[PDB]
């Protein structure tokens, strides 16, 4: 299925899945992977800001790259999804906020599931 605004996108990476929220016109909002490795520059690996990630609005094509991906709203069988008006206004309000990008924590998934389900 083609994504509609409010849909969760599951992207199959090597060893994990990256998640994004489709907002329409080929855009997603997501917890963007960091581009600075722990201990880059002057920073210590043990910095609390190691693997800091920013919530970004980006093109779906740029985030997916060549990867396989699907819409995955299967949590709709457990939780009632919010109105798309609220999902998308909530998502836009979070742009520029930060979270730890810990793959083990699944924060990229939890970020967008909270947008869809509250």
UniProtKB/Swiss-Prot annotation:
GO cellular component term of the entry, any: membrane
Major place of residence: membrane
GO terms for biological process, alphabetical: lipid catabolic process; N-acylphosphatidylethanolamine metabolic process; negative regulation of cell population proliferation; phosphatidylethanolamine acyl-chain remodeling; phospholipid metabolic process; positive regulation of keratinocyte differentiation; positive regulation of protein-glutamine gamma-glutamyltransferase activity
Keyword Membrane included in the entry's annotation: yes
Region (Essential for its ability regulate keratinocyte differentiation) location: 1-35
Transmembrane among keywords: yes
Known catalytic reactions: a 1,2-diacyl-sn-glycero-3-phosphocholine + H2O = a 1-acyl-sn-glycero-3-phosphocholine + a fatty acid + H(+); a 1,2-diacyl-sn-glycero-3-phosphocholine + H2O = a 2-acyl-sn-glycero-3-phosphocholine + a fatty acid + H(+); 1,2-dihexadecanoyl-sn-glycero-3-phosphocholine + H2O = 1-hexadecanoyl-sn-glycero-3-phosphocholine + hexadecanoate + H(+); 1,2-dihexadecanoyl-sn-glycero-3-phosphocholine + H2O = 2-hexadecanoyl-sn-glycero-3-phosphocholine + hexadecanoate + H(+)
Domain of life: Eukaryota
Membrane-topology annotation of the record: Single-pass membrane protein
Start and end residues of each LRAT domain: 8-118
EC number: 2.3.1.-, 3.1.1.32, 3.1.1.4
Residues at the active site: 18, 30, 108 (acyl-thioester intermediate)
pH dependence, record text: Optimum pH is 8.
Subcellular location field: Membrane
Tissues in which the UniProt entry reports expression: Widely expressed.
Entry keywords, A to Z: Hydrolase, Lipid degradation, Lipid metabolism, Membrane, Transferase, Transmembrane, Transmembrane helix
Cytoplasmic side: 1-118
Molecular function GO labels: acyltransferase activity; N-acyltransferase activity; phospholipase A1 activity; phospholipase A2 activity
Induction field: By all-trans-retinoic acid and synthetic retinoids.
UniProt record similarity statement: Belongs to the H-rev107 family.
Function of the protein: Exhibits both phospholipase A1/2 and acyltransferase activities. Shows phospholipase A1 (PLA1) and A2 (PLA2), catalyzing the calcium-independent release of fatty acids from the sn-1 or sn-2 position of glycerophospholipids. For most substrates, PLA1 activity is much higher than PLA2 activity. Shows O-acyltransferase activity, catalyzing the transfer of a fatty acyl group from glycerophospholipid to the hydroxyl group of lysophospholipid.
Subunit structure: Interacts with TGM1.
Record's protein name: Phospholipase A and acyltransferase 4
């Amino acid at each position: 299925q083609e994504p509609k605004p409010g849909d969760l996108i599951e992207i199959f990476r090597l060893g994990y899945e990256h998640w994004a929220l489709y907002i329409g016109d080929g855009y997603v909002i997501h917890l963007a992977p960091p581009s600075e490795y722990p201990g880059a520059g002057s920073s210590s690996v043990f910095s609390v800001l190691s693997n800091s990630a920013e919530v970004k609005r980006e093109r779906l094509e740029d985030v997916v790259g060549g990867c396989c991906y699907r819409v995955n709203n299967s949590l709709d069988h457990e939780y009632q999804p919010r109105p798309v008006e609220v999902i998308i206004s909530s998502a836009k309000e979070m742009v520029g906020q930060k979270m730890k990008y810990s793959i083990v924590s699944r924060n990229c998934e939890h970020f967008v599931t909270q947008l869809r389900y509250g």
